[PDB]
Amino acid sequence: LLIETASSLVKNAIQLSIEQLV
Amino acid sequence: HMGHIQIPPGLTELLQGYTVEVLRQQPPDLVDFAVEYFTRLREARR
Amino acid sequence: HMGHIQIPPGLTELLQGYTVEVLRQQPPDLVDFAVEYFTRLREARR
């Protein structure tokens, strides 16, 4: 599908950033 | 109030809209496209 | 494999880069920041 790839897409973006920028 | 994070809502939908049109209209350049979309969004809201 | 076109890579990094500075610069306007950032991008790579 497509809406499923974009949904989690924002989740992985937030984690890989505030986690001490890891 | 000191020592906490604040995530403003609205970035989840605004990004989902761009991810849609981009994979639907398939523009020749996402960079220049991102400028034409957001810039036009200013007139959309309100 | 089967089909023809699929989720093209490269959009995940462009978004993460924005979600980052956006949360750091915490600008009062994300719409104006997205148009000022992407627009400046094309001028960066030159």
Curated annotation (Swiss-Prot), chain A:
Task: Write out the ranges of the annotated region (PKA-RII subunit binding domain).
Answer: 2-15
Instruction: Write out the tissue specificity statement of the associated record.
Output: Predominantly in the cerebral cortex and the postsynaptic densities of the forebrain, and to a lesser extent in adrenal medulla, lung and anterior pituitary.
Signal peptide (residue range): none
Q: Which domain of life is it from?
A: Eukaryota
Query: Changing residue 18 to P: reported impact?
Result: Prevents or diminishes RII binding
User: What is this protein's function?
Assistant: Multivalent scaffold protein that anchors the cAMP-dependent protein kinase/PKA to cytoskeletal and/or organelle-associated proteins, targeting the signal carried by cAMP to specific intracellular effectors. Association with the beta2-adrenergic receptor (beta2-AR) not only regulates beta2-AR signaling pathway, but also the activation by PKA by switching off the beta2-AR signaling cascade.
Domain notes for this protein:
RII-alpha binding site, predicted to form an amphipathic helix, could participate in protein-protein interactions with a complementary surface on the R-subunit dimer.
Kindly provide the name given to this protein in its UniProt entry.
A-kinase anchor protein 5
**What range of the full-length protein does this chain span?**
391 to 412 of 427
UniProtKB/Swiss-Prot annotation, chains B, C:
The protein's PTM annotation reads: Phosphorylated by the activated catalytic chain.
Which tissues is this protein detected in according to the database? Answer: Four types of regulatory chains are found: I-alpha, I-beta, II-alpha, and II-beta. Their expression varies among tissues and is in some cases constitutive and in others inducible.
The highest taxon in the source lineage is: Eukaryota
Subcellular location, record wording: Cytoplasm; Cell membrane
What does the subunit comment say?
The inactive form of the enzyme is composed of two regulatory chains and two catalytic chains. Activation by cAMP produces two active catalytic monomers and a regulatory dimer that binds four cAMP molecules. Interacts with AKAP4 and CBFA2T3. Interacts with the phosphorylated form of PJA2. Interacts with MYRIP; his interaction may link PKA to components of the exocytosis machinery, thus facilitating exocytosis, including insulin release. Forms a complex composed of PRKAR2A, GSK3B and GSKIP through GSKIP interaction; facilitates PKA-induced phosphorylation and regulates GSK3B activity.
UniProt lists the family membership as follows: Belongs to the cAMP-dependent kinase regulatory chain family.
What this chain does, per the entry, is described as:
Regulatory subunit of the cAMP-dependent protein kinases involved in cAMP signaling in cells. Type II regulatory chains mediate membrane association by binding to anchoring proteins, including the MAP2 kinase.
Q: What is this protein called?
A: cAMP-dependent protein kinase type II-alpha regulatory subunit
Species the sequence originates in: Rattus norvegicus
Organism classification, top ranks? Answer: Eukaryota, Metazoa, Chordata, Craniata, Vertebrata
Provide the gene name from the record: Prkar2a
Instruction: Report where the shown chain sits in the full-length sequence: first residue, last residue, total length.
Output: 3 to 45 of 401
